[PDB]
Design a protein around this ligand. Structure first.
Ligand SMILES: CNC(=O)C[C@@H]1[C@H](O)[C@H](O)[C@@H](CO)N1CCCc1cccc(C(F)(F)F)c1
Ligand SMILES: CNC(=O)C[C@@H]1[C@H](O)[C@H](O)[C@@H](CO)N1CCCc1cccc(C(F)(F)F)c1
Lengths: 448, 448
């Protein structure tokens, strides 16, 4: 019994109810089974975790939970009390119980307590009752778990939730040792890999952590998360996790891009990865082949919402060409993965670096190498503009709007790069010449 | 009788109906009077300008237009056919007429044709009928204007809509000469100033253009527009346009930030500017900023107990957003050509600390250490500002701004960390160490 699906676990604008219901439909379509509710900035999840839902909010969560059951998706309600809970005040424990039991009255049977992204310092009153921060967390987690009747799925996100967050390392951490020893065995533990955003999650890294927590973890995967950098988006395939992990894990829940419609590839390729070795103990999963599968399917959504035919001498329709598979392949390569651009992106960057570095050669056989390489690069910059133009004319406006900022940025920068290469081949600005804000001026003075 | 208010004239996710109705309420509250509907990417405004609204869309626009009349705001319906229109095909002219009279059946009496951001090249069939691009535009604009019964308010956005777009200059442009001579005198002309995003709009610049278009223009002001750069936001005051312009103009319509709630200052300060010389000693941008910010503050504590003892964990959520937080925020995201005083101050202090950092390893040491600690205090104010914003009751305002405030606090946190390191950073890093994506790698190779 493996929990595979999506955690809405990110910072910023959460997903709205309509989007979550649509998520459930996609999860089911792709034979995934789990959703973990945890939006960092949905006010009653974390900041105001004490506050009960209103009659309005109650009705909406009930409707959502019913939608999950209807789509055969396990609904997991997480709460994040760690910013300000006095762990040793039993009214505080009661308040936490009240909150979770209100949600259980909405039909929810699966739960989670999360202690990610809080500092390790307890108040004086908690230091006198518990000998460490982990003891304090494990005590209320155990007490809540049993208060709810030992539900079949209950998750715990540790504060040391990845290799690099473990002081002094994974295998000797007194925080994780305590979690492994004291956290009740029915409770599952979340883990993001060697890092917050793990490039790879090697099998031996999971053998290491499994030993100290004394269970196989559930992965909380940040591979496609994009809340940490305003300019980033990830449309590359699920990658860097061997299918051999599946037998050594209780699940994988991916925490993907903030922009809902940008997660077609992220979730589709996750599903393809899970399905490839669902009952494992000869290569089963190819990230490229999976990207192509995801993109081919995604394409069909662009021509669906969410005449005049001009003669030979007349102005041809601006709107005539639909988005192509090749446009989406290019787009994904430009906004690929946190540690890697896709082949076409890396190729354009390499060609531009070369054209810039050999540009003195204008002013030999080397000139026609430069001019032919430049014209081929301009062709590629043209494909980026073409991709933007056809996206901006697509019938699915909802997908367009989620992606707009990103595609506009890349096309806009490729247009400056193209223009710059043309200028190299020929020997009071608007504000978009000088980009990034104040933020960007600070950033440019830091080491890169 | 002066048109002052807002044009929704930008690229990307348009505003939804609820937000537009809320705009009308604010415009009225601040004694502004005009809204110009022109979202570049609302599909039936520009790309698919030929397509009639559905029953659903019709009902929504009717409701919106009624809301405008109810709030004493003139509603102006713009359409942008320039990407695609064969100007000489009378079916095309008929299609345009059909579209506009559908909108007039929704209750709308004011209209606009826009030819901004299209190229100057006509199809063969239009070249045989019209001797220039301006003749073609002026011909259908005049024909539509009279077909609608010469409505009291009808606007025209030229293709050469600012000083720098005029070939070869404003006073000798054969495009604008033709517009001035041939465009019917009842029709108003839109103008963005010397530039697309005009730092200043000098009086003599408007005297220059007024002479050649043969009327006073309506300014389409892009001062606070932020669609051109994904990282930018503008919360500084309306600035750089003398109150002496008002007698020489038919109006000012501001095209502000994409994020609806970020436009409290942009629109409020515009209103204060207009009201100051309705019929520069009269308008102070700083005093106006302060007025706007003080008023805006009241919105943060309104949606759209437990008391811990001396030894217990204090509430994370206790401190509300302050006026000083919003003053700091505005100074960090101020104006397209200028940061606010606190922003410029932090940048200056960081440049100094970086450039004199060798001094660690004299009186100069204690100058460095005292300046550094004072800079860390200021970086802490940025984090404080973020944390208190993220706890505010108006979630709608928070979410519109989230990306920006998160970015600035995130970068100030790296800058703070970097100054601390200088007073005492790579290896296997998380992705947010290296910011900006593919786009950012291209940008860093362009000249700065
Ligand atoms: C399992 N729990 C987590 O991974 C916690 C969080 C969120 O879930 C988030 O979606 C995900 C990926 O971003 N995590 C980032 C943590 C590092 C961080 C914190 C604050 C600020 C930054 C920043 F400096 F990068 F902005 C990073
Ligand atoms: C009166 N009409 C206008 O001003 C037209 C547009 C939109 O209204 C937009 O909201 C405003 C400010 O951005 N204008 C920018 C024009 C320059 C441009 C065009 C394409 C792309 C770019 C970019 F690459 F820089 F982003 C700029």
């Amino acid at each position: 019994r493996f929990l595979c699906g999506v955690v809405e676990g990110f910072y910023g604008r959460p997903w709205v109810m309509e989007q979550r219901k649509e998520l459930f439909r996609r999860l089911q379509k792709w034979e995934l089974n789990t959703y973990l509710y945890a939006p960092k900035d949905d006010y009653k999840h974390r900041m105001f975790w004490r506050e009960m839902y209103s009659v309005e909010e109650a009705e909406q969560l009930m409707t959502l939970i019913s939608a999950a059951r209807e789509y055969e998706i396990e609904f997991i309600y997480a709460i994040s009390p760690g910013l300000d809970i006095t762990f040793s005040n039993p009214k505080e424990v009661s308040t936490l119980k009240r909150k979770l039991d209100q949600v259980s009255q909405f039909g929810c049977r699966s739960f989670a307590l999360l202690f990610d992204d809080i500092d390790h310092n307890m108040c004086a009153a908690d230091k006198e009752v518990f000998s460490s921060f982990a003891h304090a967390q494990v005590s209320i987690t155990n007490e809540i778990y049993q208060y709810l009747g030992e539900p079949e799925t209950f998750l715990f996100c540790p504060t040391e939730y990845c290799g690099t967050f473990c002081y002094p390392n994974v295998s000797q951490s007194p925080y994780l040792r305590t979690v492994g020893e004291k956290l009740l065995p029915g409770i599952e533990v979340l883990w993001t890999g060697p890092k917050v955003v793990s490039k790879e999650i090697p099998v031996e890294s999971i053998e290491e952590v499994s030993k100290i927590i004394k269970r196989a973890p559930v992965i909380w995967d940040n591979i496609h998360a994009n809340d940490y950098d305003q300019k980033r988006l990830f449309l590359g395939p699920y990658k860097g996790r061997s299918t051999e992990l599946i037998p050594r894990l209780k699940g994988v829940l991916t925490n993907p891009n903030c922009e809902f419609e940008a997660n077609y590839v992220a979730i589709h390729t996750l599903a393809t990865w899970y399905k490839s070795n669902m009952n494992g103990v000869d290569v089963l999963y190819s990230p490229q082949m999976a990207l192509k599968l995801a993109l081919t399917e995604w394409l069909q959504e662009f021509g669906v919402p969410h005449q005049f035919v001009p003669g030979p001498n007349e102005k041809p329709l601006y709107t005539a060409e639909p988005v192509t598979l090749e446009d989406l392949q290019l787009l994904a390569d430009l906004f690929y993965l946190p540690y890697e651009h896709g082949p076409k992106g890396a190729q354009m960057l390499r060609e531009f670096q070369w054209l810039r570095a050999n540009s003195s050669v204008v002013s030999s056989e080397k000139i026609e190498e430069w001019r032919s390489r430049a014209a081929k690069f301009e062709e590629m910059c043209g494909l980026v503009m073409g991709m933007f133009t056809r996206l901006s004319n697509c019938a699915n406006r909802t997908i367009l709007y989620d992606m707009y900022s990103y595609v506009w940025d890349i096309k806009s920068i490729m247009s400056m790069v193209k223009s710059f290469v043309q200028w190299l081949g020929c020997r009071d600005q608007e504000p978009w010449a000088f980009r990034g804000g104040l933020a960007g001026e600070f950033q440019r003075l830091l080491p890169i």
